[PDB]
Design an enzyme around this catalytic site. Structure first.
Site, PDB file in Angstrom:
ATOM      1  N   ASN D 204       0.564  -1.108   0.068  1.00  0.00           N
ATOM      2  CA  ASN D 204       0.117  -0.191  -0.049  1.00  0.00           C
ATOM      3  C   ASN D 204       0.864   1.222   0.012  1.00  0.00           C
ATOM      4  O   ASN D 204       0.408   2.259  -0.501  1.00  0.00           O
ATOM      5  CB  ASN D 204      -1.100  -0.021   1.177  1.00  0.00           C
ATOM      6  CG  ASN D 204      -2.354  -0.372   0.584  1.00  0.00           C
ATOM      7  OD1 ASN D 204      -2.581  -0.768  -0.545  1.00  0.00           O
ATOM      8  ND2 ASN D 204      -3.306  -0.398   1.613  1.00  0.00           N
ATOM      9  N   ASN D 226      -6.577   0.961  -5.791  1.00  0.00           N
ATOM     10  CA  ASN D 226      -7.462  -0.546  -6.433  1.00  0.00           C
ATOM     11  C   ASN D 226      -7.486  -0.233  -8.004  1.00  0.00           C
ATOM     12  O   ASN D 226      -7.141  -1.495  -8.444  1.00  0.00           O
ATOM     13  CB  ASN D 226      -8.881  -0.444  -6.259  1.00  0.00           C
ATOM     14  CG  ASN D 226      -9.053  -0.916  -4.358  1.00  0.00           C
ATOM     15  OD1 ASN D 226      -7.954  -1.403  -3.765  1.00  0.00           O
ATOM     16  ND2 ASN D 226      -9.922  -0.660  -4.003  1.00  0.00           N
ATOM     17  N   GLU D 248       1.710 -23.209 -15.346  1.00  0.00           N
ATOM     18  CA  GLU D 248       2.966 -22.745 -16.075  1.00  0.00           C
ATOM     19  C   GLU D 248       3.591 -21.475 -15.639  1.00  0.00           C
ATOM     20  O   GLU D 248       4.702 -21.277 -15.839  1.00  0.00           O
ATOM     21  CB  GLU D 248       2.440 -23.018 -17.566  1.00  0.00           C
ATOM     22  CG  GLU D 248       3.392 -22.488 -18.564  1.00  0.00           C
ATOM     23  CD  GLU D 248       4.110 -23.329 -19.417  1.00  0.00           C
ATOM     24  OE1 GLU D 248       4.456 -24.484 -19.160  1.00  0.00           O
ATOM     25  OE2 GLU D 248       4.443 -22.648 -20.991  1.00  0.00           O
TER      26      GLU D 248
HETATM   27  N1  LIG Z   1      -5.196  -1.605  -1.713  1.00  0.00           N
HETATM   28  C1  LIG Z   1      -6.303  -1.360  -0.836  1.00  0.00           C
HETATM   29  N2  LIG Z   1      -6.116  -1.553   0.402  1.00  0.00           N
HETATM   30  C2  LIG Z   1      -7.353  -1.561   1.275  1.00  0.00           C
HETATM   31  C3  LIG Z   1      -8.457  -1.500   0.717  1.00  0.00           C
HETATM   32  N3  LIG Z   1      -9.312  -1.573   1.802  1.00  0.00           N
HETATM   33  C4  LIG Z   1      -8.529  -1.549   3.006  1.00  0.00           C
HETATM   34  N4  LIG Z   1      -7.406  -1.467   2.666  1.00  0.00           N
HETATM   35  C5  LIG Z   1      -6.118  -1.649   3.458  1.00  0.00           C
HETATM   36  O1  LIG Z   1      -6.343  -3.034   3.994  1.00  0.00           O
HETATM   37  C6  LIG Z   1      -6.063  -3.018   5.308  1.00  0.00           C
HETATM   38  C7  LIG Z   1      -7.476  -3.607   6.072  1.00  0.00           C
HETATM   39  O2  LIG Z   1      -7.576  -4.659   5.480  1.00  0.00           O
HETATM   40  P1  LIG Z   1      -9.445  -5.082   4.972  1.00  0.00           P
HETATM   41  O3  LIG Z   1      -9.331  -5.940   3.947  1.00  0.00           O
HETATM   42  O4  LIG Z   1      -9.860  -3.508   4.673  1.00  0.00           O
HETATM   43  O5  LIG Z   1     -10.059  -5.393   6.324  1.00  0.00           O
HETATM   44  P2  LIG Z   1     -10.348  -7.210   6.523  1.00  0.00           P
HETATM   45  O6  LIG Z   1      -9.395  -7.857   7.357  1.00  0.00           O
HETATM   46  O7  LIG Z   1     -10.556  -7.993   5.163  1.00  0.00           O
HETATM   47  O8  LIG Z   1     -11.633  -7.303   7.322  1.00  0.00           O
HETATM   48  P3  LIG Z   1     -11.744  -7.020   9.048  1.00  0.00           P
HETATM   49  O9  LIG Z   1     -10.881  -7.596   9.695  1.00  0.00           O
HETATM   50  O10 LIG Z   1     -13.250  -7.363   9.736  1.00  0.00           O
HETATM   51  O11 LIG Z   1     -11.518  -5.507   9.235  1.00  0.00           O
HETATM   52  C8  LIG Z   1      -5.745  -1.784   5.723  1.00  0.00           C
HETATM   53  O12 LIG Z   1      -4.141  -1.827   5.742  1.00  0.00           O
HETATM   54  C9  LIG Z   1      -6.153  -0.909   4.770  1.00  0.00           C
HETATM   55  O13 LIG Z   1      -4.930   0.174   4.449  1.00  0.00           O
HETATM   56  C10 LIG Z   1      -8.873  -1.560  -0.731  1.00  0.00           C
HETATM   57  O14 LIG Z   1     -10.057  -1.398  -0.981  1.00  0.00           O
HETATM   58  N5  LIG Z   1      -7.522  -1.372  -1.532  1.00  0.00           N
END
Ligand SMILES: Nc1nc2c(ncn2[C@@H]2O[C@H](COP(=O)(O)OP(=O)(O)OP(=O)(O)O)[C@@H](O)[C@H]2O)c(=O)[nH]1
Ligand SMILES: Nc1nc2c(ncn2[C@@H]2O[C@H](COP(=O)(O)OP(=O)(O)OP(=O)(O)O)[C@@H](O)[C@H]2O)c(=O)[nH]1
Lengths: 103, 423, 103, 413
Positions: D204, D226, D248
């Site tokens: 990120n 994204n 592959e």
């Molecule tokens: N690149 C990108 N990073 C994201 C996005 N949404 C959240 N993040 C990052 O991903 C991390 C959080 O993970 P998430 O996928 O949002 O949360 P989750 O773990 O899957 O679900 P919970 O544990 O319930 O909160 C943080 O570091 C955010 O900066 C996204 O849409 N794109």
């Protein structure tokens, strides 16, 4: 959308009443494809005021050399049998209008 | 903070309403199928302007300040099918018959029957507002419900509440009895609506075919264009921030309407870039502003530049890469516009982008070329009425022959108003 | 300035009449110290409208896990026994207000 | 024609998938709201690798499964994608994972596992030839990390012969707050290391920088990040959609099972506001082009794949580049080139670089060190301890990451 040949240029462009814009172009020209959708809008907004014609230089190699064309796309504005103005290269739909407004 | 209620009438109205509310939910981070937000989080922005909160934060909900009315039930059934528990079920009112494309059915017949229920829901929504700032009526005027009951309800609204601003957003048919219903509805929109924003289906069709390459555009495509414009106009009312210029419906119409007899508006949007490329392809400010003021960008089949501007608002939202450039550009436009009646040129800014464009603009104008759109309509009406085409449809329904002459004359009085404003 | 324990949370926060803002924090958290002077100003300007409470997560490890806290500082707005809104991380005294104004 | 399933998990994962699937639909000429193609005509390329067909003159359905422990992202996808997806494959619960790996792996994520595995069973069975599963997830939270790790492990236990590629979004360092993210990331890394066949990282911090410095956005949105990921992913998968299998592809990128972490880069990185081929290649390989906060040119390349997309001399500049790369000496290397006619809808021509590079270690060691900042004082220990993890278990996983770093450190001679 008016397509032209070398044979039809005389009647369609030169003997024509009213103003006419000719797009010398090709399929292998990136920038020419860029303005194809742009030229359609002008064909609407300049109804009666202008007619828009296209000449594909590959299948009609005879006409462009007569007008000193340096490349494509080249827009030529004709009034009678005369070149009023010239635009070389792909452009905005807005710069095209300011070009049409003044001439 | 101002509250807005959105009332949608008939097929077009409700289908647009559904698309609008889904977009607004997404802008505010409200789940568009349940009215909920993630655990612990509140919606973004000034959500209470368009939503009310139900109950505790755990099992609770954010409910569109919305009422949907139809006579035919298909469209409201579809809303129920696609929108989970978002709406208040008590606010989705329908019957059984359609109005069969008959204005008189909606205004005098089956429409009068639905009115006490619809008005009672308005009561409830109104009273549960801290401060009501306006009512938006979403409808098409070519059919018989939106036109007839739309006419009935705006009239009713103004008699009972008086001071509340009422804005009509009205869809116009594209070149059946559509010209008749349009003209009949126009009278009420002229006399009783505080303002009416037109959406010309003819222009929308062209834009969707032209700018977007859709060979056979559907109503879904046309609604995308309307929804963007509605989201954009309402953004001043739904957000706050350090740079966000908050503007009420009151303030907006005040600036857009110089006299009560000239309150018909048109709008343009930019970018009109195809959704296909939306985030991958961007216009710079130059091309964007240029496009906004282009004749090919207005949601009306006519050319604002060949007429005269009575008034103008440019409503910008999203990223501002270069504010000196945008100000230079708008100042230049301001000195380029054909003018009348003294003019206004208002500029709004909202930080929050919409969901599809990093930056976008809506142009609202009170312009005299609206006369052209209206003229097109009246010529079609006269073409049928000269020979009394479907006249018995309306005669056997309670309208008298002389009273429809009054409404044809009423609309003519409005078309002459805008022609006089030009010269 | 209201200090809380795990034992006092129920009465002080959940059974409380009117809105309440809880700051979950620690001494070893840089950003938490950053907003300590900020939170005092809000305790003045929102008299009657809000009560401001603090819970130190080291000496009271029981409460934060119940609310799904992802880190500190975390500001939680309670009304009845319910979380109205959430602010994670240190912030301006101005962004805090706009957050309080809307909810 | 080999089939690929995409399983997306958690907030980030599903937001990225939603945008991935819309794009891939457009590339194939499939309507992303209905699943239909222009009447009579079929979708472009090897569509069956990512979609499966329903009727006749009929609908195309993505080989997609979306999972979350919170309902609002999956509800957004439903609101905004019509009848595209299979309703049975969009799985959500209510309460979230509260940014805690353990809830995802031991708690609530354990409870959705069977339903998820059931949907996997079904998507695997309907494949004529299953080539691979891809898992999109962020690993900073609780769901993508905890449930993501749980699903990967489940998948390899039961299927085993199926290649799993994890596309893992790593969290950027927070300065406004002290967060649990480093714990979650390290906990997930253990699984990515022992069970996944490869893991493609998306840092990120680098994506923000790329959006800020190269795309010119003053302050990038998650939606900007994204879109960077989407186009890389569209690019990686392009080689499979127009053909080579996931297997592959991973075979050539991975020389030892203990060195299966990847970085990627993209060209052109021009702002959303046309380049020469030699300069595109030059850009693709610059340090400031990688989707990770490290400098690939200052480490060593184990293996490389360049996948060019769009419109000779192209072979000359790639050859020149090959010879300029610092190479791992005793480990086998590869430099694989791919060409695909159909372009991204974004750019008339473009390239993705996938790379196995020792500089991944600086990214991983940044994560390890943020963890140690927290663990030195048992910062949020009871969050994890009161959810089924032991103190000793935390240490074991911390040591596992240190071992991953060490592997790549050794690979750099
Ligand atoms: N690149 C990108 N990073 C994201 C996005 N949404 C959240 N993040 C990052 O991903 C991390 C959080 O993970 P998430 O996928 O949002 O949360 P989750 O773990 O899957 O679900 P919970 O544990 O319930 O909160 C943080 O570091 C955010 O900066 C996204 O849409 N794109
Ligand atoms: N832009 C747009 N126009 C629509 C839409 N639906 C219908 N229309 C147009 O609206 C006009 C018909 O009005 P409707 O709203 O469908 O009729 P109604 O009042 O709802 O229903 P009835 O009185 O029972 O016929 C025609 O000009 C249609 O082309 C829509 O979803 N979007």
């Amino acid at each position: 959308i008016i397509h032209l040949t070398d044979d039809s240029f005389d009647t369609d462009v030169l003997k024509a009443d009213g103003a006419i814009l000719v797009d010398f172009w090709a399929e292998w020209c990136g920038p020419c494809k860029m303005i194809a959708p742009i030229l359609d809008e002008i064909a609407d907004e300049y109804q009666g005021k202008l007619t828009v014609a296209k000449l594909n230089i590959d299948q009609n190699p005879g006409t462009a050399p007569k007008y000193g064309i340096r490349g494509i796309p080249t827009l030529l504005l004709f009034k009678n049998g005369e070149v009023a103005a010239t635009k070389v290269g792909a452009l905005s739909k807005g710069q095209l209008k300011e070009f049409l407004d003044a001439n | 903070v101002n509250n807005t209620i959105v009332v949608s009438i008939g097929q077009a109205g409700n289908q647009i309403a559904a698309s609008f509310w889904k977009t607004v939910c997404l802008e505010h981070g409200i789940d568009p199928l349940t009215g909920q937000t993630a655990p612990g989080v509140a919606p973004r922005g000034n959500w209470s302007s368009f939503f009310s909160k139900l109950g505790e934060s755990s099992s609770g909900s954010y409910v569109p300040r919305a009422i949907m009315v139809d006579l035919e039930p298909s469209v409201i059934d579809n809303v129920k099918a696609t929108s989970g528990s978002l709406f208040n079920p008590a606010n989705l009112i329908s019957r059984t018959e359609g109005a069969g494309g008959n204005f008189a059915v909606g205004y005098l017949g089956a429409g009068r029957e639905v009115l006490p229920e619809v008005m009672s829901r308005l009561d409830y929504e109104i009273d549960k507002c801290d401060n009501v700032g306006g009512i938006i009526v979403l409808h098409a005027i070519g059919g018989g419900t939106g036109s007839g009951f739309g006419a009935l309800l705006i009239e009713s609204l103004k008699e009972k509440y008086g001071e509340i601003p009422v804005l009509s957003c009205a869809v116009l048919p594209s070149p059946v009895t559509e010209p008749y219903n349009t003209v009949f509805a126009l009278n009420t929109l002229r006399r009783s609506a505080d303002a009416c924003l037109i959406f010309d289906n003819e222009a929308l069709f062209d834009l969707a075919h032209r700018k977007w390459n859709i060979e056979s555009p559907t109503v879904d495509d046309l609604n995308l264009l309307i929804t963007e414009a509605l989201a954009g106009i309402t953004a001043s009312m739904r957000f706050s921030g350090f740079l966000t210029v908050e503007i009420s419906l009151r303030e907006l119409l005040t600036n857009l309407v110089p006299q009560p007899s000239l309150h018909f508006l048109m709008c343009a949007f930019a970018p009109l870039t195809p959704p296909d490329r939306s985030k991958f392809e961007e216009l710079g400010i130059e091309e964007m502003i240029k496009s906004l003021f282009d004749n090919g960008s207005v949601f009306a089949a006519c050319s604002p530049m060949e007429g005269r501007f009575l008034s103008t608002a440019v409503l910008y939202r999203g990223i501002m890469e270069d504010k000196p450039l945008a100000d230079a550009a708008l100042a230049a436009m301001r000195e380029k516009l054909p003018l009348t009646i003294p003019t206004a040129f208002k500029i709004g800014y909202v930080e929050q982008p919409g969901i599809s464009h990093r930056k976008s603009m809506v142009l609202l104008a009170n312009n005299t070329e609206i006369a052209r759109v209206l003229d097109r309509i009246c010529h079609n009406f006269d073409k049928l009425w000269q020979r009394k085409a479907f006249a018995n449809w309306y005669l056997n329904e309670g309208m008298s022959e002389e009273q429809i002459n009054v409404l044809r004359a009423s609309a003519q009085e409005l078309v002459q108003s805008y022609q006089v404003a030009e010269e």
